[PDB]
Design a binder for this molecule. Structure first.
Ligand SMILES: O=C([O-])/C=C(\CC(=O)[O-])C(=O)[O-]
Ligand code: F3S
Length: 862
């Protein structure tokens, strides 16, 4: 092990980074070395054992804990460690396989006092808390002091409180920092390897930042130079953390600006982040990771400024002058506790341990922790979302500003956050899921897998199914297209993807840390956000699509003055709030998804849309058959699938839907009149908020077109097909087509549409995210494209590419003529397909497809 291991150390040091943690195989070999240590290797072997092994239920941890338990029990011996030392080290693995040996040690007069100190600061006790109470009740004195210790919150009070004065050096990034900037798509493969992945942070050049190697390595040396001023760094920007939920963005920042975690290799916590505006998902990820995120005016903060931050006072001052630079308020006072605990998650878990111990010993109620603020007189009614969250909490409704913990009915996970989520789950010592349903897809890496992705394909499914989750297969297609067909109406959920925007019920997307917690405990912490109401009125004009309406939201918000495009001092009524939509209650559920999905680009924390029962009834009747069919096909964890089917059947039998009260409170109400939308609306190159009417950008030359995000359904493809079929010959553009699911692909194939795409010269990609994410295939450098995908951030679909977001029907026209069409032209082409609109926009209903029902009829409920 040793020789190969330090060759690795050297390879990595040459590149300036830490070595990867030991794996199970290496840990096993290490065990042998500890039993018979070669001369002169004592200190190395001890460091590897102590600092270079993942904690929790990682496979290497299993091996490490087993070895140590044996040492502590005399069952094994090493000249380098004593039983006392083994117990001490066991107390450093935070949870999982180290707890049993630690509890057993309480029955040993020698080790007990040490085991007790270790358990006293162990948070991940979960059900093991009872094992400890039982020993105390049987007369164990050391068990008693552990209980009292938990009861007194020693684990919390022994941690340094948040200082009153923080002196930090400003690392300032002007404009908007989205998570792609911090953690680029093409580098998604290295996310689980924190130190390596961090090298890509801000690798693309932008104002005031100097990448050590443009397009490959970020401003590591610029960062290092700033660290020499003697103060810790703070990340500072006008708009921070918009876009993708990838925790890797946070991991990277903290790797450079955070603090080490004792005995946990290659992962950092803490830190400070300041932005004019901070996207809600990013904010959560930062607080869960132990950082302190603060929304404040940053115009007076400059690259390299040394600064004094006073959390309790809410002031930022120049360090040399004492001048006031800005003032602020923490979003909640509980943040102070979160930082002290090392993050919101550890806080919740630890606080619950103390509470549990306080009730066992018959004590009052802790006064050590800050409580969430109280909400005033509960006179008025509730909005749809407030009722949904309320019901998930056993109450009629939850008010904005309140802290709550909704039950998680559905949890989604995809393959680019999956590996991180899996790691976070290991850190939380999770061996089984408590959420009602956890589904894992393989949509982001299936088309052009790297070797590491292949390992992901062969390993993540089991990790998920063994915990009771449902797993799809590479080639099945996009997460949301499947996940949405597994949802229960009016319920609450989350997912490791920013586009987890349930078209029925409500979801609050999150980073891998919180997704792990929600999967494991079946619950999610939530500071209830405010809502913004968007109301559609009237009838759609000719040739207008649902997608145009999605884009009209930012458009009208800009007209009314609730949204601005300029990044400095950006205004955005939607940021951090729940977007609630009404006015289109008869939309098919997948149509509803187009609107709810796009709430992500609004920077909304979540979304609801009011729908009638019929379209949901149709959807569920179709989904029941799909799920039975999945069982017949052999899919991941049958029991979970079966229970979900029953849940759907129960609802169909008594179809009830929640509804907003007429007197609900909203932060703002936006009315949009469909009669005023006469021409298609696009999102102009590189900003999802920059909505413009077709007439404003008509004539722009187009190189490449992309059709097929989770924003599309089979109807969009039929539409594009009919348009292409009408104008035979090869296209002047490069057209990419990517059906969201294999069910979609198969039906289009059966209907003859692949011949149509084939003759046109189009590329048909396998079911999955394809170009939408930009992590595998990419558009040509500097190309101008029109895309039905969700995000046109700089460098996403391609390097230096300019991307217009539009509807599928408009995109098909553009692909045909090589440029954005004029409103008149657009209407001429589409008029043609409207004649057969009934045939074109037929949705997939699995209960009407024999190949599906036949397999469903063959299933016996276990
Ligand atoms: O990178 C990821 O796997 C997270 C995503 C995908 C993306 O950025 O489209 C998200 O939260 O949306
Ligand atoms: S990345 Fe995939 S999940 Fe949807 S938003 Fe794009 S197709």
């Amino acid at each position: 092990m040793l020789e190969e291991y330090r060759k690795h150390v050297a390879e990595r040091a040459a590149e300036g980074i830490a070595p990867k943690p030991l794996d199970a195989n290496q840990m096993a070999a290490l065990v042998e070395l500890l039993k018979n240590p070669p001369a002169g290797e004592e200190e190395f072997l001890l460091d590897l054992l102590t600092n270079r092994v993942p904690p929790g239920v990682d496979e290497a941890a299993y091996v490490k804990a087993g070895f140590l338990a044996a040492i502590a029990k005399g069952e094994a011996k090493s000249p380098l460690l004593t039983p006392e030392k083994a117990i001490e080290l066991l107390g450093t693995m935070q949870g999982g396989y180290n707890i049993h040996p630690l509890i057993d040690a309480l029955d040993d007069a020698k080790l007990a006092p040490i085991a007790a100190k270790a358990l006293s600061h162990t948070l991940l006790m979960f059900d093991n808390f009872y094992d400890v109470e039982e020993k105390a009740k049987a007369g164990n004195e050391y068990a008693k002091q552990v209980m009292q210790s938990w009861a007194d919150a020693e684990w919390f009070l022994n941690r340094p409180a948040l200082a009153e004065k923080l002196t930090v050096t400003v690392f300032k990034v002007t404009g908007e920092t989205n998570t792609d900037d911090l953690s680029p798509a093409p580098d998604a493969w290295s996310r689980p390897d924190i130190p390596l992945h961090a090298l890509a942070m801000l690798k693309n050049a932008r104002e005031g930042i100097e990448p050590d190697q443009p397009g490959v390595v970020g401003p590591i040396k610029q960062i290092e130079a700033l660290q020499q001023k003697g103060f810790p760094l703070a990340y500072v920007g006008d708009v921070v953390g918009t876009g993708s939920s990838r925790k890797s963005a946070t991991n990277s920042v903290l790797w450079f600006m955070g603090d080490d975690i004792p005995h946990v290799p290659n992962k950092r916590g803490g830190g400070l982040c300041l932005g004019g505006k901070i996207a809600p998902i990013f904010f959560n990820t930062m607080e869960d990771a132990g950082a302190l995120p603060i929304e404040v005016d940053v115009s007076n903060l400059n690259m390299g400024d040394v600064i004094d931050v006073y959390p309790y006072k809410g002031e930022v001052r120049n360090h040399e002058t004492g001048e006031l630079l800005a003032t602020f308020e923490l979003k909640t006072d509980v943040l102070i506790d979160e930082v002290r605990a090392g993050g919101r998650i550890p806080l919740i878990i630890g606080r619950g341990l103390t509470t549990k111990a306080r009730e066992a010993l018959g004590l009052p109620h802790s006064d050590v922790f800050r409580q969430a603020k109280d909400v005033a007189e509960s006179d008025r009614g509730f909005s749809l979302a407030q009722k949904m969250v309320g019901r998930a909490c056993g109450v009629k409704g939850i008010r904005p500003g309140a802290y709550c913990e909704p039950k998680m009915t559905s949890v989604g996970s995809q393959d680019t956050t999956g590996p991180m989520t899996r790691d976070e789950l290991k850190d939380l010592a999770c061996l089984g899921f408590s959420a009602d349903l956890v589904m894992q897809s393989f949509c982001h890496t299936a088309a052009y897998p790297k070797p590491v992705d292949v390992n992901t394909h062969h390993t993540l499914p089991d990790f998920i199914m063994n915990r009771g989750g449902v797993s799809l297969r590479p080639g099945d297609g996009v997460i949301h297209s499947w996940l949405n067909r597994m949802l229960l109406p009016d319920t609450v959920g989350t997912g490791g993807d920013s586009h987890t925007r349930f078209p029925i019920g409500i979801s609050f997307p999150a980073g891998s840390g919180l997704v792990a917690f929600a999967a494991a405990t079946g619950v999610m912490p939530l500071d209830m956000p405010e809502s913004v109401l968007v109301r559609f009125k009237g009838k759609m004009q000719p040739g207008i699509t649902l997608r145009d309406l999605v884009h009209a939201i930012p458009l009208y918000a800009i007209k009314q003055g609730l949204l601005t495009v300029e990044k400095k001092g950006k205004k955005n009524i939607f940021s951090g709030r729940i977007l609630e939509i009404e006015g289109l209650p008869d939309l098919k559920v997948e149509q509803a998804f187009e609107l709810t999905d796009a709430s992500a680009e609004r920077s909304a924390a979540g979304c609801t849309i009011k729908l009638n029962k019929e379209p949901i009834i149709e959807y569920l009747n179709s989904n029941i058959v799909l799920l039975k069919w999945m069982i017949a096909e052999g899919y991941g964890d049958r029991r979970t699938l079966e229970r979900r089917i029953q849940g759907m059947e129960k609802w169909l039998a008594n179809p009830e839907l929640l509804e907003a009260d007429a007197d609900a409170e909203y932060a703002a109400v936006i009315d949009i009149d469909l009669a005023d939308i006469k021409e298609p609306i696009l999102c102009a190159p590189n900003d999802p908020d920059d909505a413009r009417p077709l007439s404003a950008v008509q004539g722009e030359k187009i190189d490449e077109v992309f059709i097929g995000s989770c924003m599309t359904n089979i109807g969009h493809f039929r539409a594009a097909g009919k348009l292409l079929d009408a104008h035979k010959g090869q296209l002047p553009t490069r057209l990419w087509v990517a059906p969201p699911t294999r069910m979609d692909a198969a039906q289009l194939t059966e209907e003859g549409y692949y011949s149509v795409f084939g003759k046109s010269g189009a590329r048909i990609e396998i079911p999955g995210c394809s170009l939408c994410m930009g992590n595998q295939a990419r558009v040509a450098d500097g190309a101008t494209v029109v895309s039905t995908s969700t995000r046109n951030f700089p460098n996403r679909l391609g390097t230096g590419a300019n991307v217009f977001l539009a509807s599928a029907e408009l995109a098909a026209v553009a692909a045909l003529i090589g440029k954005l069409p004029t409103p008149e032209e657009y209407q001429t082409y589409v008029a043609q397909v409207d004649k057969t609109a009934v045939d074109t926009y037929r949705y997939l209903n699995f209960n009407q497809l024999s190949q599906y029902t036949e397999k469903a009829d063959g299933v016996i409920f276990q």
